[PDB]
Amino acid sequence: AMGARLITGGTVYTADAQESVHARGAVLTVDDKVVAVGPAVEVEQAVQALDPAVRAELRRLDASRMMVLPGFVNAHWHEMFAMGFTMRGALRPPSDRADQVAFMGGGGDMHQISATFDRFDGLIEAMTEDEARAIAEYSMWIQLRGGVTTLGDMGSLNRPLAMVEAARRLGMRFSASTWASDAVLAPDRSRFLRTRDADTVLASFEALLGAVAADPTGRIRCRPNVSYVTNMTDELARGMAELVERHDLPFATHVGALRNEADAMRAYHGETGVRRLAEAGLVDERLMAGHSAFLDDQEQKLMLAGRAHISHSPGKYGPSGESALTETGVVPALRRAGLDVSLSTDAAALPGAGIAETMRAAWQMYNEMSADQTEVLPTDALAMATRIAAKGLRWDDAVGSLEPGKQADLLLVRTDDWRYLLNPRPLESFLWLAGSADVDTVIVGGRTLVEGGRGVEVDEAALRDRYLQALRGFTTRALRVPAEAVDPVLAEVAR
Amino acid sequence: TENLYFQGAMGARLITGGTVYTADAQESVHARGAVLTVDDKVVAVGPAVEVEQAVQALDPAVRAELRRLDASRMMVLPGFVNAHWHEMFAMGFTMRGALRPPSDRADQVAFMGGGGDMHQISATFDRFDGLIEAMTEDEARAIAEYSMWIQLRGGVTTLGDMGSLNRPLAMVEAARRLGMRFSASTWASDAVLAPDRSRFLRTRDADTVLASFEALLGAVAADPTGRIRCRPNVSYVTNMTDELARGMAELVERHDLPFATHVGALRNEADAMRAYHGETGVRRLAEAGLVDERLMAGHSAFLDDQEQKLMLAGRAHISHSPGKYGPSGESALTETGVVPALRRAGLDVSLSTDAAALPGAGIAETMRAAWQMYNEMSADQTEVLPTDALAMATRIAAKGLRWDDAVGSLEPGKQADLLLVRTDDWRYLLNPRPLESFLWLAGSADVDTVIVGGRTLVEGGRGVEVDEAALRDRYLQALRGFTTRALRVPAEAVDPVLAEVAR
Ligand SMILES: Nc1c(O)cccc1C(=O)O
Ligand SMILES: Nc1c(O)cccc1C(=O)O
Ligand SMILES: [Mg+2]
Ligand SMILES: [Zn+2]
Ligand SMILES: [Zn+2]
């Protein structure tokens, strides 16, 4: 048991229903849960109400030189670190001058994207259980280090049980998934090609659900996803709808992500993504739609009528050549209309924008588009990365805000340097001039996992070295990159 | 004399083993590169082994005193050239500042937001001369030195004033004391747009404003450091008479100077310009002879096709500040898309921070913003490459400032103005492009070392000669006096905020 902890004296951002901020606020936790949060004097009354033996062992943390946030909920993420040598990765020349528009850039290479997604099952099968565990634990550590206390898999190039084991070892919360692709859009065909049977794909998810059902930690859940609506048969869509109704689960997919998606969907499936999801019964409160910007008026109305959720990743669109913010403006418009919209990192094969970077991006970019410095307030960017993300993941019963009865998941950020001087809004200074590396302390269920920007039980150097060994094996064996190209890069690593 | 500020010659320095970004004309990047400097200048830059050959060619006495810096765990950048900045820290209590409630929930669209409150902006700018006069020499010195220190700390080695609420000679003295380079200016507003009037109100004589700039130019003509230049500006085309515009054109031709102003900054600007001046900003500048190669235009996004053609024909320069538009409620990137379009058409476009009264986005944050935002708008990850974002904050900015003779790139004969950033942590692991990792996950505070003219001013993220706590405390004392006396904020509101400061 973690017993009682009092974190007192800092600026506390709650992300509660009123987006409450407490200057010189305090948080009292007992075991895994928040018990009191508000002005220091009010929380001191809760301290006096503790069991005497619990009060005797109270851990008092003077956070007067810090800001307190809820733990970040990154509900749209992919484990892709196994592709570090090949995907925008380690073998590129140092000069960027010859870079080309490719993959998700220029409206999207829909054939290449579809084929790449349909290859995941084969590559996951080729990865060893040991490689999967080493790569997952390092990849998920990097999320935790940047303040992500609850992480959502929306389809990973890794083994689901390896990622569950990594989350268990790290102490973070994880919504696990399985890879789901049962169709490919091929250049030499006028219609989708079925690549595997929907019932087998659904059985893979049911096997994961069976494996994590008996989790006693409260830190492991699961959520089925479809990779991308291009790679989704009507049978897979209807099967997902039946599965999430039967098990009372959330559902996630990627839809309306790219300019070129709608034409490819009409050519290969006869209908666009949101309308295909709607026909299957998937456009409802359970849906987290990744990106979801290339929607016509009817699809926007389906999302609003269904009270579906959009996860937006404005920190990473430009470097991918994606245009899911400004080309249509649909996601900010649906948010203004009162659709739930959260912020997520998406992912790549090397470290990219974290939640802190994504919060800055939304604050800058949504506000500039509308000439309105109030459209996304800093506290809105925080809500979008905590409470609203937890609601989309159906984990807001336990996480996403600092309120009595919720899990004691919180971050401390130091505010005593030049960036924060004279600002009564330390979260604003954090969005101007700080990021993932400025997360100092990470607490999950009352347990400190990160302190002073260092792992408490995590050995960062040990996780890194096991990840690099695993990456070497997978890259040379499964991706067939010559050892002659890999080993000199690993020899360069600053240990 | 220079000796008042710093003493001694820097001799030879070899910075070797890191990834070196030159921002030279070829945007050259050297993995395991090196930079050899002698006194104030770069002598050689390239692969470590090639630069070692240049070390062997040094004068023996110079080689005997060579300082070798192991940059193997670092990235080397040119010093940032922030050519569009304002000293505004005197307004820390009033401008999106220290007296706001901690909750942001009641914030309103105001000032620059919602297309721009053109009357309020114009009136605010025209009040600067009175507030600068009200500021004491001691207040000006303390506020300038801390404000400009924060720029230097974030890797700005060359800073351009485009109109400050501070005393010009106080900012020049601050730059001399800090060891950085500075393009000084003077405040220039001779018109205001008032609600109850059919044309602009002339608020002072153009010759007064011109004389103020000529006095600064006279004061810094005698500068022996090579670190101080000056450039006249007009605050904003709203606050500019035809007489001031023509006087500025005559002055920059006679003295062979660059010129800067703000134009096409806001949706509501064009209608206000037509209502009060009979013509929009770029066309008024063009009529005065100011749309030419000397011009650095701040923001410059709300331009019609004819105004875009005037800028291209004149080969003018735009300084863009995409890191800070959203928090001001500005729309100078996406509403028109003009600045990325002019860049694609071959106009010189640089990146700058603009400024506010408290720390905001620095150059590192602005480079990330351009990389994300220009590329997302075009669905093109190659429109602004990371090395383009660096060029826009170094060499191209120096060209717009007319300082590219000496700064903005690591090339033989240019000034030894360099940054080091540590690249040994998780953010950079396996990336052969550390600048890309820096744009993803780092910023101003990750600048480790700052060298100007071969002299280390910042090392391990700390001032070498700067007393950080002392600069801060002098700034806070100066801010207290100015805020209570000149801005008439009650001491009862100011003192509790100063009592809260964490020392
Ligand atoms: N980023 C994506 C995109 O542009 C299209 C389809 C899927 C994704 C993704 O986030 O996996
Ligand atoms: N940011 C500005 C604006 O929006 C209008 C006019 C001037 C400025 C400025 O940068 O000073
Ligand atoms: Mg509008
Ligand atoms: Zn995704
Ligand atoms: Zn400006």
Residue numbers in the entry:
A (entry chain A): 0 to 494
B (entry chain B): -8 to 494
What is the paper's account of this structure, in its own sentences?
We reconstituted the biosynthesis of the benzoxazole moiety found in nataxazole by adding two enzymes (NatL2, NatAM), to 3‐HAA, ATP, and Mg2+. We show NatL2 catalyzes ester not, as previously reported, amide formation; the amide is a shunt product.
The structures of NatAM with 3‐HAA (1.25 Å resolution) and 3‐HBA (1.17 Å resolution) were obtained by soaking and show that 3‐HAA and 3‐HBA molecules superimpose, as do the protein structures, which are largely unchanged from the apo. In both complexes, the oxygen atom from the carboxylate coordinates to the zinc ion displacing the water. The other oxygen atom of the carboxylate makes a hydrogen bond to His290, which makes a salt bridge to Asp345. The structure of NatAM identifies a water molecule bound to the zinc, but this water is displaced in every complex structure and thus seems unlikely to play a hydrolytic role.
